[PDB]
Amino acid sequence: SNPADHFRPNLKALTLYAERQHYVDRWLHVKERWLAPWYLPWWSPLFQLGTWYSQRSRNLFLVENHLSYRPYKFRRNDEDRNNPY
């Protein structure tokens, strides 16, 4: 145990936390702000690059119909194998 503890980074300074929802929403707001102006037509490759893949992934998530249960990604405790909740 103790010898195993010697293999750690020795210059940790700061740790920051952020929810996936929050920064995803902020990124979406930024993307909308930069893709909103009229001088960027919807048919431009830039706009499609920005939007189409995200739309496709979200649609795939919505269409999902799985017989099993996927535990919440951001639970308080994900270390217990016998408690998916």
């Binding site: 010898p3 293999f7 020795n10």
Partner: protein, 231 residues
């Protein structure tokens, strides 16, 4: 989660800036074979076979600044994580593989189907092709696993032996003044010999492991190179 940390190379970066503000020749390279791929004259390759030199040299420098200096006590190998090494090897190996695949020359893979026409195609040659395609990825995985395991094991052993040496030196040196001083002297001499041997072994093994790490990538590249003859 975002963790802010720093590598353990700041003093070494300072030394690099101090000692390399002026030019200096380089004549000793850990992996020299990246510069000499062709040994028979009049053979030339249209593929960018010398593209790996810069990455090879930089990787050697980085891994040497970390691993070789890690023999100094309390020096940290900041990158020592299994999946991080996996990411590094993935980058290099898959980048070269996709360079070969983007060439869109399918004949390049003809050699994957091992054997000759005499062997049964479905029951022998196809299985061999499956095994070889698996073996490429297995070579990548083995490279990264070997690099990780060598460092981990060597440093574990060094830590344990140093702990034992500290214990006996501190809590049993009084035997020098006692009647059993000969036993302590013998043990101390053995410990010194073991210390020197371990340090030499680790020094050699680090360089050799870097050599092998670069040689695996170069072997991947060479397996798909084709040489034309000048006329």
């Amino acid at each position: 989660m975002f963790l802010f940390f720093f590598c353990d190379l700041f003093w070494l970066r300072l030394l690099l800036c101090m000692y390399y503000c002026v030019w200096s020749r380089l004549c000793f390279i850990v992996y020299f074979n990246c510069l000499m791929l062709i040994f028979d004259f009049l053979l030339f390759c249209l593929f960018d076979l010398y593209l790996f030199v810069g990455l090879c040299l930089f990787l050697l420098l980085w891994f040497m600044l970390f691993n070789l200096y890690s023999l100094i006590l309390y020096y940290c190998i900041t990158y020592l994580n299994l999946y991080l090494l996996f990411c590094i090897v993935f980058l290099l190996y898959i980048a070269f593989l996709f360079l070969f695949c983007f060439l869109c020359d399918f004949f390049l893979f003809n050699n994957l189907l091992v054997g000759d026409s005499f062997m049964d195609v479905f029951f022998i040659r196809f299985l061999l092709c499956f095994l070889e395609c698996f073996s490429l990825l297995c070579r990548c995985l083995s490279t990264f696993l070997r690099l990780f395991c060598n460092l981990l094991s060597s440093h574990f052993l060094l830590l344990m032996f140093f702990d034992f040496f500290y214990f006996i030196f501190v809590f049993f040196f009084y035997g020098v003044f006692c009647y059993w001083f000969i036993l302590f002297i013998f043990v101390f001499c053995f410990c010194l010999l073991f210390y020197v041997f371990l340090y030499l072994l680790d020094l050699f093994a680090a360089i050799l492991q870097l050599f092998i790490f670069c040689n695996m990538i170069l072997q991947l590249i060479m397996d798909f190179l084709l040489f034309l003859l000048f006329v």
